[PDB]
């Protein structure tokens, strides 16, 4: 992994502290704006839905690709029936809290170990460790995890990895496909900021690029930078056009 | 299946002779504009890439989802095909030479077997192994495409579930958090004024927790009308609230 400090310009103009990690073909060929931050570990927030969904399927907590998460009857979002894809792609706190409780802590721990997922610390509450608990993961580790999923190399069936991968598709054109996932822990303060993420991969013609971005957030209006900074960096590398 | 005569309005403007079949939830609930036409059988043209890809994977001719189909540098009919392509790419830019080569490696005995299992059309692959779907005798109806695509959606085709899922991702054409379209076009050519060609668009839409299966075909003798194969069906779906 090499450092490209010229990438800092994209963060500085907005006064944001963050990191971007980008790898072409494999995790053997990565660059970042900040080597130190690239390996610092942050709460995953909703990026945890990726491993949670896979564990859910492997264990049977989630039955199959076509399962519907029906509303039982504070957020409008949480009052609608959702597909797995819908649950991943829109806000659905109650769905994932229930999946995590059903998996349980022993099984959750085994899978995080198999996946080499961050610090693998799930204390803080079975239904909130990824959001207000002790779990932490680096941008580097995100890229490594996502590459394994891309290749179907996680300790999970190929079918379940494929199911999760379809649910992560967010942009589609004939020769350009994007799988990605945001995460956001909440707006913190200047001295105790939250963290926001954007992770995924881009398949462009026959190349693949893995990416992971994170940033400290203390101002609600800065949230969209989680997509625009990586996009600008990717653009300057020639990926987007 | 019932007939929705009001849908004809979308064909009258452009004088198109064709048919749209739309099914909500499953193929046990279908509507179409032309009952006669819905079961009539036509050359599938590039819509055949869907079973061809599944069969390619099942036979091991296509190695896995990440297989790259390398360009040898020699002229192809379309500039868009003159490059290395992934499986998704090859399908989406409808790279005929890539799939002709797949067919040849699959071969007639295996192809016949899989189409029988898939209940694909008239299952007639005479006309040469690398052209039966383009200029040969293979024929499938809009209602048959819908049956086949539902099986694929449900993973009920006689192929591994992994392979059905691979082809499924390769067919994604429109994505949003609660909206996903999987689709494939086809076009046989312009034929003559008297024996015109056929144009297709087939697929399914997942909107919130519902699924809609659809197929459309139309007669065509002028290439400039090609886009109506998407625009007509799209107009009917949007008028039904599928957007």
Description:
The complex is a heterodimer of chains A (241) and B (243). In chain A, 35% of the residues lie in helices and 22% in strands. Chain A contains ten helices and nine strands. Chain A has helices at residues 9-12, 35-38, 49-59, 84-89, 93-103, 105-114, 129-132, 139-150, 158-168, 225-236, and strands at residues 2-3, 18-24, 30-32, 68-69, 82-83, 169-173, 176-184, 194-204, 207-217. A seven-stranded mixed beta sheet of chain A has the order 1-3-2-9-8-7-6, sandwiched between helices. With 241 residues, chain A is an alpha+beta fold. In chain A, a hairpin with a 5-residue loop joins strand 2 and strand 3 (30-32). Chain A has one domain (1-241): 3-Layer(aba) Sandwich (Beta-lactamase). Chain B has helices at residues 9-12, 35-38, 49-58, 87-92, 96-106, 108-118, 142-154, 161-170, 228-239, and strands spanning 2-3, 18-24, 30-32, 41-42, 140-141, 172-176, 179-187, 197-207, 210-220. Chain B has a single domain (1-243), classed as Beta-lactamase. Chain B is globular, with a radius of gyration of 17 Å. In chain B, the strands form two sheets. A seven-stranded mixed beta sheet of chain B has the order 1-3-2-9-8-7-6, sandwiched between helices. Chain B has a two-stranded antiparallel ribbon with strand order 4-5. Chain B has nine helices and nine strands. In chain B, a hairpin with a 5-residue loop joins strand 2 and strand 3. Chain B is an alpha+beta fold and 243 residues long. Chain A binds chain B through residues 65-66, 68, 80-83, 85-86, 89-90, 151, 158-159, 162-163, 165-166, 169-172, 174-175, 177, 203, 205-206, and chain B through 65-66, 68, 83-86, 88-89, 92-93, 154, 161-162, 165-166, 168-169, 172-175, 177-178, 180, 206, 208-209.
């Amino acid at each position: 992994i090499t450092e490209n400090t010229s990438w800092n310009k994209e963060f500085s103009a907005e006064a944001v502290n963050g990191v971007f990690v980008l790898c072409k073909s494999s995790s053997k060929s990565c660059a970042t704006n900040d080597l130190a931050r690239a390996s610092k570990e942050y709460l995953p927030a909703s990026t945890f839905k990726i491993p949670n969904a896979i564990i859910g399927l492997e264990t049977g907590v989630i039955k199959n690709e076509h399962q519907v998460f029906k509303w039982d009857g504070a957020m409008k979002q949480w009052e609608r029936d959702l597909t797995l894809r819908g649950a991943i792609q829109v806000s659905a706190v109650p769905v994932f809290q229930q999946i995590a409780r059903e998996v349980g802590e022993v099984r959750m721990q085994k899978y995080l170990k198999k996946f080499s997922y961050g610090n693998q610390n799930i204390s803080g509450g079975i239904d909130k460790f990824w959001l207000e608990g002790q779990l932490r993961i680096s941008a580097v580790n995100q890229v490594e995890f996502l590459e394994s999923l891309y290749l179907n190399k996680l300790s999970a069936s190929k079918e379940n990895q494929l199911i999760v991968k379809e649910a992560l598709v967010t942009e589609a054109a004939p020769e350009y496909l994007v799988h990605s996932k945001t995460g956001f822990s909440g707006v913190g303060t200047e001295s105790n900021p939250g963290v926001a993420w954007w992770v995924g991969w881009v398949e462009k013609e026959t190349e693949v690029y893995f990416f992971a971005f994170n940033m400290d957030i203390d101002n609600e209006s800065k949230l969209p930078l989680r997509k625009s900074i990586p996009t600008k960096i990717m653009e300057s590398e020639g990926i987007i056009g």
